[PDB]
Design a protein around this ligand. Structure first.
Ligand code: CU
Ligand code: CU
Ligand code: CU
Ligand code: CU
Lengths: 448, 448
């Protein structure tokens, strides 16, 4: 059996990619056994930071006290391994004594992974020349609500059944319209919950979505939610999109901070859906740095470029942005769904547990508005409407005009504003505050 | 014509990758025309630094004076752009006045390639409905030899025809041997140039390459060359492999510094081979950051892993390293071939110019050793022979014994050293004008 003739670029495949994901981050480390000590270091209160590149097979990291890992000077021990032949059963790295003035390894680590949490555990050996063991427990990735706090009144408004159900139904109706039957459509029209004008509805996802002015509804509605919300708390826009985590090799203290989610804007790591590799791969892609540089940075550019925006009506712009960038902002800062203590909540499951403040899942409009990060990017989305106005004031002077609609700064109809009646639901368009049971009912019509 | 239903991960295709590589780095810049001014900045002596991710479509960067681009405080102008439907004809970015307290763009920039070339462009102030131009010339990526200086004594040895042809023929004989006919093989034998022992030759790339002991010739000869070079100049080994450039988003001075190649160790940018896309992509790959994290970091760990090295004889180790890591180290640090005033020097072309110091092309053993970086990584390689000895000194104590061989510190034959007569051309297994002629002949026999 012949050895290779040359090297080829051997990027990590799925198993490797996923193992790296389980390794990557900050771990709490204890030494254990009779002869278990590292020079300069206690046996408890240690930490282990590990990194692996997005498609990398190398494994790097550091081992010192927490305060020393955030420090400027070199950490006492450095990690160098690789993942060839690695799995949850065997993961090996070497330790380099960085005080010693030699890069020759001083230790041989071997580990077993169990179970963003997890456990690494195994044996160490002094290579110089015995019962030497360690146990490392991965720190949880902090959630946004643990880092941005929404005040008593605001949260009350967000978590409430009036609002959750409004938000869910508002999307469900416009989102599903083009696939709903004439029987279902009449059921909704009759109960005042059709998307927009009766018999001239503005479906969000059908073949003429760009032109039918559904874009305006999207932009306007969330502006109205922004005004209401901003009257109860200072919810500033992001001005720039968060950049992906600075890799461990270039800025070690910055990497560690990131996994503490200091500002709530760290990207929660991707989760694996069981039996759904299409979905696991899709979410992984959109949360990656490749996505930031291929898609998100482009959107950040396009939607502050006058020449780009000046080609577009308000409703064309709204459609493009809701369907591309907006749906991806949600799932990129999405954290895995939780309980009162698996798989996502079914659309019609109105169990009391699903109404808690603990439920802020960004993937579902019944919950997404509760997540703090929501307000930063809907904030950012909303400010781009102003860029778009300026774009037209430059290229098409006085061809869109400012105007107050439903107590909100907006824009008169014109060549670049297709409609003057934005859809806030029944208040503005019902021809049969809001009834909770009417909403529950309309959602049932929509989901079979 | 319907719009997209959703986003997908849209990485750059070949055209945008290459365009990205043309932009990336440091440009000198001056403004031209009657109305050409930026507030707080001279009309000339400016610099523009740009980055694009490996497979990014986004374009970022900064525009300021050189000292300001290297400074800790934020530059006056930030570039935000994208490359969608850009090309050498049209390239667009917005500028943001970071002194202004707003991220709204203040200028629309547009540029064309003037066919490491040159951009001619226009800028429009975004507060008007002018003659405002700029000319930007990309800075040359310095070559290793412009930054690490091999002294007159050492350089003279390395460039001399005798040593150039030796290095080429030492490699060519063993590399092609397995493909050579018995006519070609007897001619070389009768001139003293067979790769190792007469009728028991140690081909480097044949079917039994891993086990025929060839790998020992590889390690030894370069140890011998190293010992010679080191007598004339202090040439330390790399201890750790240089990491890829730090991205512009996280460390803007570090990024800029990189394209100055301050220590000779920056990865020279991949060149497009005209009419060879297989080659163009392959080169790009091994010079990439993915390559560092997927192959090079793996090699770095593997060859300092006692458990890995202790599976291998010296002749296996040497073969594995030569064919994989060592051929890729060469191309990774290679800058393009240049005639000492486009296309590669053919093996049998002994035209006097190719002998001049300026031919230090890493791709070809005729020139590779003239490159200063050659010695840095060959030292790293040679240091790893000691990790291997310690590995067997741990798992197989006493089974590998040291010995001196041809003036060089080495190892005796044994279980893990399959031969004790390492090859160095005619001097071990066989006035200067006679043998440069012998060697030229020998190279011509091989290359017909
Ligand atoms: Cu949203
Ligand atoms: Cu919404
Ligand atoms: Cu070499
Ligand atoms: Cu060589």
């Amino acid at each position: 059996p012949q050895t290779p003739d040359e090297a080829s670029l051997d990027l990590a495949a799925t198993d490797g990619i996923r193992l790296g994901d389980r390794l990557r981050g900050l771990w709490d480390l204890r030494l254990v056994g009779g002869d278990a000590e590292l020079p300069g270091l206690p046996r408890e209160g240690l930490q282990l930071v590990l990194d692996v590149a997005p498609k990398g097979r190398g494994l790097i990291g550091y081992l010192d006290t927490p305060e020393r890992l955030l420090a400027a000077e070199p950490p006492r021990f450095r990690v160098l391994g690789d993942l060839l032949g690695a799995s949850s059963a065997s993961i090996r790295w070497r330790l380099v004594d960085q005080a010693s003035g030699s890069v020759a390894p001083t230790h041989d680590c071997s580990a077993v992974f169990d179970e963003g949490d997890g456990t690494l555990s195994g044996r160490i050996q002094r290579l110089e020349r015995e019962d030497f063991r360690f146990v490392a427990v991965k720190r949880h990735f902090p959630l946004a609500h643990e880092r941005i706090v929404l005040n008593e009144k605001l949260l009350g408004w967000l978590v409430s059944p009036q609002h959750r159900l409004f938000h869910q139904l508002w999307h469900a109706s416009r989102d599903k319209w083009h696939r709903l039957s004439e029987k279902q459509r009449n059921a909704l029209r009759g109960v005042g919950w059709q998307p927009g004008p009766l018999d001239r509805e503005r479906d969000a996802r059908g073949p003429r979505k760009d032109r039918n002015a559904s874009g305006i509804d999207f932009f306007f509605m969330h502006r109205h939610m922004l005004h209401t919300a901003r009257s109860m708390q200072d919810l500033p826009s992001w001005e720039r999109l968060p950049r992906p985590v600075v890799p461990l090799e270039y800025d070690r203290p910055g990497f560690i901070r990131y996994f503490d989610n200091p500002d709530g804007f760290s990207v929660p790591p991707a989760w694996v859906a069981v039996d759904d590799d299409e979905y696991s791969e899709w979410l992984h892609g959109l949360k990656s740095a490749e996505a930031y540089h291929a898609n998100f940075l482009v959107w950040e550019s396009q939607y502050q470029d006058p020449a780009y925006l000046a080609k577009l009506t308000l409703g064309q712009f709204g459609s493009e942005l809701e369907l591309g960038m907006h749906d991806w902002l949600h799932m990129r800062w999405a954290s895995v769904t939780r309980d009162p203590s698996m798989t996502d909540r079914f659309p019609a499951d109105f169990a009391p547990r699903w109404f808690r403040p603990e439920n802020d899942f960004l993937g579902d409009p019944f919950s997404s508005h509760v997540n703090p990060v929501f307000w930063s990017f809907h904030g950012w989305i909303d400010d781009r409407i102003e860029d778009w106005y300026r774009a037209h004031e430059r290229f098409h002077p006085g061809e869109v005009q400012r105007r107050e609609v439903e107590g909100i700064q907006w824009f008169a109809p014109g060549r670049w504003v297709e409609v003057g009646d934005p859809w806030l639901g029944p208040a503005t368009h019902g021809c049969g505050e809001l009834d909770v049971e009417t909403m529950k009912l309309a959602l049932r019509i929509i989901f079979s």
